[PDB]
Subunit: 296 residues, 2 copies
């Protein structure tokens, strides 16, 4: 049994447990047309302060900078792991990313953000994210080991963390102020699907660690740690930018930073590595409603 | 404007009209778990003749030989036409083919046809189909002209013709005898999506004819006609095989042949070529109910 070995016949499956990720993404299926964003537009116009409007503007630009794009990694995974069950999951995930793109493209239009988004790659903090996401993928085609590192970084640090500070910010407006219910619904649906995407990569990692332990060298983990540090520093910079004009009365920048730092620790621990950030349990209690909503 | 030219920015779309095929396939979305097949299994065991059982067995094997496979052409289209709107349609189409695969894999298992399907290449007519489908694709990466020929043959023949004799056969049991209602519903839903798939390819053909006329040489059309004839001969052989133990009391082989010969003529006319076959109006009237059902 090897993930890298092509298999022509559909059945019997070699990795039947992976099909649960296809079942999961079918259950999570959603389209933005299931929500009416009229109340969100009203909220953006007259129910928030200028400080809050600046936060929401930059948070939605940051979400869209990932979601409003062509995302083909999961759809292409079969080229590296040529298994029928890999294509079943990867192609279903790619379609889910089309649905996400349509949702956030619609929201950019409705919030009047198209012009700002056209220039989004101008913001220094966005450039920092682009830098690490490009670094994550740069060598994916060089070797099996380099591909596996790209897969791990994408699954555990992009899919499970990059957008989550923005997801928490947007859903916090609904939790604390009963505002932006439509965007809260779209963000919740998106979060659940990104959780599924990253968990697929975690399963692949555990399989790969058993099948080809020689890929997982000291050098592999040292580079992974360096890349994860670059990613966290960039997502902190995104938070500094989002809150540059003032913080929210109901959710501080530090609390959001603590939330994603805990997710970096969790990803490192999932990989077998040590956690490195000192987490506030009190601030985690402040945001734990989000994890209960997304995962329960 | 050129389909071969990469575009990075999502909006504005260069080919916004192609997004209607994404809308269409979202509207047609279905899973086989929406249907109860228990009545169909009982029908297969107890409510049909030995002649009818042979027809259904081979017809379901023939549908499955295409549908129960790894089908990546639409997902890979972006590699050749690197447009966001192409990925939107192609990725959504690929996911629809995963749903088709799951439906017919389920029906193979429920009808006890797994072992027959494992040996489906023993059948001469199936080998004839494999041969033309391989011929359609084997040069797709040699040149732009070869890729477009593969795209045209896949669109106008594999998606619009290959399975449709089998779709008509399966839905005819419900139409004339109120049997196999579950499979009728699944085949109807499959037919609607294959219609959408082929229509997308037709739209691409018309665009390419205008943008890239240098591809559509006398030699291109000569090779197209040769491949189309090879494919139609093979689908006639599939029909001969499906009915070789006897024809149905309510639907003759000639009537089904006439139906697909008309579709074949129509694909040729769509391409600007002459129709090949004389078509019986009376037999077309016998199967008109099917086109009404699919096109509603
Ligand atoms: Mg909920
Ligand atoms: Mg109907
Ligand atoms: Mn997404
Ligand atoms: Mn994702
Ligand atoms: Mn299909
Ligand atoms: Mn199709």
């Amino acid at each position: 049994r090897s993930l890298f070995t092509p298999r022509f016949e559909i059945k019997p499956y070699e990795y039947p447990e992976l099909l649960e990720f296809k079942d999961a993404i079918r259950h999570s299926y959603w389209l933005h047309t299931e929500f009416n964003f009229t109340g969100d537009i009203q909220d953006f116009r007259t129910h928030i302060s200028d400080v809050e409007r600046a936060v929401i503007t930059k948070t939605m630009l940051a979400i869209s900078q990932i979601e409003v794009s062509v995302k083909r990694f999961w759809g292409n995974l079969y080229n590296y792991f040529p298994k029928p069950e890999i294509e079943d999951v990867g192609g279903s995930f790619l379609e889910s990313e089309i649905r996400h793109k349509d949702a956030y493209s619609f929201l950019l239009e409705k919030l009047g953000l198209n012009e700002m988004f056209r220039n989004v790659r101008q913001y220094k903090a966005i450039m920092a994210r682009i830098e690490y996401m490009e670094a994550f993928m740069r060598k994916k085609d060089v070797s099996q080991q380099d591909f596996v590192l790209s897969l791990v970084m994408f699954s555990l640090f992009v899919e499970h963390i990059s957008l989550f500070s923005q997801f928490v910010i947007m859903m916090s407006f609904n939790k604390h102020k009963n505002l932006f219910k439509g965007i809260s619904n779209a963000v919740e649906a998106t979060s659940k699907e990104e959780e599924i995407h990253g968990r697929f990569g975690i399963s692949l990692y555990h399989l790969l660690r058993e099948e080809q332990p020689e890929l997982f060298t000291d050098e592999f983990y040292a580079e992974l740690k360096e890349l994860a540090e670059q990613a966290f520093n960039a997502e902190k910079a995104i938070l500094d930018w989002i809150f540059e004009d003032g913080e929210l009365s109901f959710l501080s920048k530090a609390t959001v930073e603590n939330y994603i730092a805990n997710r970096y620790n969790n990803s490192l621990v999932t990989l077998g590595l040590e956690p490195i950030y000192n987490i506030s349990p009190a601030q985690l209690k402040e945001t734990e409603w989000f994890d209960i909503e997304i995962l329960s």
